Amino acid sequence: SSPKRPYLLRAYYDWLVDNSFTPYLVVDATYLGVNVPVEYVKDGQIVLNLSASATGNLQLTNDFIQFNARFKGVSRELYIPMGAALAIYARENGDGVMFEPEEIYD
């Protein structure tokens, strides 16, 4: 059956937003297919602000996360395969979850 990760991710995103937290996503920028600004990658990882105000056309689908965001005032489109989403947490207090490894992703 399908991976649980995208469902847990959307569920946690909603919990975070409903509690007034800013949703931060930790991404493995080395994962095949990840398309993000390389200059912001630190040790092969990048943390992205997924709040409504900081993103444009946010999509949290089963296979990927996609949206527009500004980096130094320049709007850019990011594409993150679901297998590259490692965890999601509140910027304010670190509460959230790290997704469990799922065979289909590796």
Add this chain to the structure above:
Amino acid sequence: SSPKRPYLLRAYYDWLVDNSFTPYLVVDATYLGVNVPVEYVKDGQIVLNLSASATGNLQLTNDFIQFNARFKGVSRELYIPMGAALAIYARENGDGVMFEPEEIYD
């Protein structure tokens, strides 16, 4: 902040339905406020079919689960406080999750 249980429950419910599974909910019938047919309770626990075909007016809110269902052809309304939802799983293969204890519920 608010309990994560109702969000994980709705997320797992959707994953189950999307994978063609029949969502079964394990409930602690001894929990205060639970309103279910006592004659179906086994050892203080009751398992309920939450599929769309088997329920009427299904509500999965943050504080409770409510819906109409037939027992021996007689329609009855069930009310389950979220603190009484112990786990949710697929009737077909048992895949699902048991919710973690959360202080606010006990």
